[PDB]
Design a protein around this ligand. Structure first.
Ligand SMILES: Cn1c(=O)n(C2CCN(CCCn3nccc(-c4ccc(Cl)c(CNC(=O)c5ccc(F)cc5)c4)c3=O)CC2)c2cc(Cl)ccc21
Length: 218
């Protein structure tokens, strides 16, 4: 129940990445979540390969690389593959390539994941604070989202149907307006040094709590 959290303060969050024209938000959200679990378990912060997912977690996992995917099935891949690579060994090139996974350069591992219940921002607050950063889908289809610079983001035409993957690294409030602290993979020059604060407890605003999920290492 702590009023506000920020996983950057605990050293569990990597640099803000840049997905470019390639629509791999799902991959970045997934690697982002795990990065923290890797830090909580081993004390090391290393950026995990988003490309490894784009190239290797494909048809079998209902994913289509640069044309979208799911964080849930990405975790499944990492479990099935018994590991993921470091971004340094398998870097991001913003396009669909052949699977080039090398276990020699295995950076981390995943044991299971957990899909949090639909639209429950209270449960999402619990997970974020107790378990760590949570991969979520949101409705980023509107210009206001692209244009976002600062403060608590609220779009009245935003639906609960999610198309874009992001990572909830914290929560809190600004002048009474509650927010979710979301790391976005759209470069450092998006919003607040690559982050966006989005309205919290305003009826699952933009589908933030629609499909939340987090991995775990054991
Ligand atoms: C082929 N295949 C699947 O597609 N799934 C599933 C993959 C995901 N699940 C979970 C449904 C929950 N959910 N519903 C709606 C929207 C999202 C969602 C969450 C985050 C983001 Cl970023 C997005 C956006 N993704 C896309 O727009 C997108 C995804 C894939 C793609 F190819 C193109 C676009 C959606 C979600 O997770 C259902 C079926 C399978 C499951 C099994 Cl056991 C076996 C084969 C499967």
């Amino acid at each position: 129940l702590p009023d506000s959290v920020d996983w950057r303060e605990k050293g569990c969050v990597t640099e803000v990445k840049y997905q470019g024209s390639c629509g791999a938000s799902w991959a970045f959200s997934a690697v982002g979540a795990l990065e923290a679990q890797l830090k909580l378990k081993t004390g090391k912060l290393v950026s995990l390969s988003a490309q490894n997912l784009v190239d290797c977690s494909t048809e079998k996992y209902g994913n289509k690389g640069c044309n979208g995917g799911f964080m849930t099935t990405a975790f499944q891949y990492i479990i099935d593959n018994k590991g993921i690579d470091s971004d340094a060994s398998y870097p991001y090139k913003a396009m669909d390539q052949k699977c080039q996974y090398d276990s020699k350069y295995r950076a981390a591992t995943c044991s299971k994941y957990t899909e949090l219940p639909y639209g429950r921002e209270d449960v999402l607050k619990e997970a974020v604070a107790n378990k760590g950063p949570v991969s979520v889908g949101v409705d980023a289809r509107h210009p206001s989202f692209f244009l976002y610079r600062s403060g608590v983001y609220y779009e009245p035409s935003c639906t609960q149907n999610v198309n874009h993957g992001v990572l909830v690294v914290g929560y809190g409030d600004l002048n009474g307006k509650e927010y979710w602290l979301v790391k976005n993979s759209w470069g450092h020059n998006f919003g607040e040094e690559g982050y966006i604060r989005m309205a919290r407890n305003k009826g699952n605003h933009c589908g933030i709590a629609s499909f939340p999920s987090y991995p775990e290492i054991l």
